[PDB]
């Protein structure tokens, strides 16, 4: 219609109002996705030796089988259109596995340091006194755990086996 | 810096401008003096332009005031945030991480600008930490004995209880252990003495 | 209209001549003289940033 | 995206500056004239630390810092004439 | 044609007007989630419930 866009200029500008619209809902979800994963600097790894006292984290850890790289729970909550007349979808700036990487570093760093990584300098400590001193936010001493840490570890596993039954048999 | 408080004036003028701008437009109209067309065309079909004209008028205050309101919704949120993070950090210590800078909050001192305002949070951050050989707890001779508040460390050759915020060696003695069980469940026991003043 | 007209592996029963899709659009055609199926697709676009 | 004419893509990785999509960051940085090149962003350095069952990481020192935070409280106010936006004389 | 454009134009300013309205409530619970794992991922949180 090479006479429609003549009388398209008669109206007024209004073209630059909905793309200047458009590019800021565009930044502002940039930002959105920025702002919640992007909040250390360094990228901490996990150590070879997977004994943290008992505790069972298989679950949650990375699979370095898979070239997704993303742990068993991320694999069941992943696995569950064209130009029609100019409208086009941009792509995000975060890819998934940037994301993946985000999430297992921060993973990585909880438990490596505890409370301290996102205060201050990186702090080594054990994951049975991580716990001990957690307890003691609460009012529960130190006792109780250094004596029924067998049990503890047995629940926790118990509830992470049971979490991801749950997950896949919820469908809504 | 103050590109947060820029951005508001900015998009309050362009907003403006373009209202300005939305008047000098024919909507399906042969002109946009009111007095010349009413000048040249016959009162019967004066009526039939004004009215395109006065709807597109009416249509572009109502998108301006529609977009006014949804700037001003989130105006209030942000003063309402703003309102609730002044009324926690200025009178009143909070415990809440990350929620007052980044570091154990201590103090903070509001300040004044236009249409905003301007916080200066004061944090506490360790450094020059060093590596020590830490244990759960120590056996006496007939007994167990677990810090109160501390951690037992080594130098390597002696045993000292520290706190958790800054090395300070103190000697162990009964003031500041107590005894729970003996030394049987507990995985990792080191074989120690106490002091007893 | 206007495109690029290609060969398609379509099954159209001995009756139908138009062709609409899912978004009521056309995308196949039939050849008039010579009963091939055809398949349009929209010309090339996009936008430009610098 | 699409196809970007106008830079070559470097095998290195540093901080993002220009935002194009799916990663792609764009710079005008040196190769040793100036040019623009494309790169992939980098999301930190490592900083792997040790984990064994019997140490401990006590501090020595401290530091004050003072940081700021900018928050918008208000707007300015408008007010339009309904007769006069409307019509003339 | 001019009638067409008018509708065609209305539709688009209230599909914008509806993309606005949803952004506002996403970026609001963008920032409710980032503020929750910010309290949780990072330290003990004495909050209830």
Redesign the interface.
Known sequence: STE?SN??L?????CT??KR??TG?AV???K?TQ??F????????T?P?KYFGGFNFSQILPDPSKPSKRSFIEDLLFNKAQ??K?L?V??????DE?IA??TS??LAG?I??G?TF?????????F??QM???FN?IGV???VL??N?KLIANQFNSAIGKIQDSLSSTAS | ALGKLQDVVNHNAQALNTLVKQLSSKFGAISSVLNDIFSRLDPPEAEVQIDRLITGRLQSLQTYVTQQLIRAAEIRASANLAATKMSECVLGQSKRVDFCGKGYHLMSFPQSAPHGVVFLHVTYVPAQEKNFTTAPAICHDGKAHFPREGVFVSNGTHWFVTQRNFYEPQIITTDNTFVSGNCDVVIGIVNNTVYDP | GTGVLTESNKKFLPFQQFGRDIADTTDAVRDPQTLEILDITPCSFGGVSV | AGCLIGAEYVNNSYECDIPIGAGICASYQTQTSQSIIAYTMSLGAENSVAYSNNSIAIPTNFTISVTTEILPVSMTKTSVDCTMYICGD
Do not use: H
């Not at chain 1, 992007?38 to 790894?45: E, H, L, M, N, S």
């Open positions: 429609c009388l398209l008669q109206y007024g500008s209004f109002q909905l619209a458009l809902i502002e979800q940039d959105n702002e919640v992007a909040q250390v600097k360094q990228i901490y790894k150590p030796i130009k029609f100019g086009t941009l792509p995000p700036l975060l890819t940037m990487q985000y570093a921060l909880t490596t340091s409370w996102g205060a201050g300098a990186a702090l080594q400590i054990p049975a006194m001990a001193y957690r936010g001493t130190q006792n250094y004596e840490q």
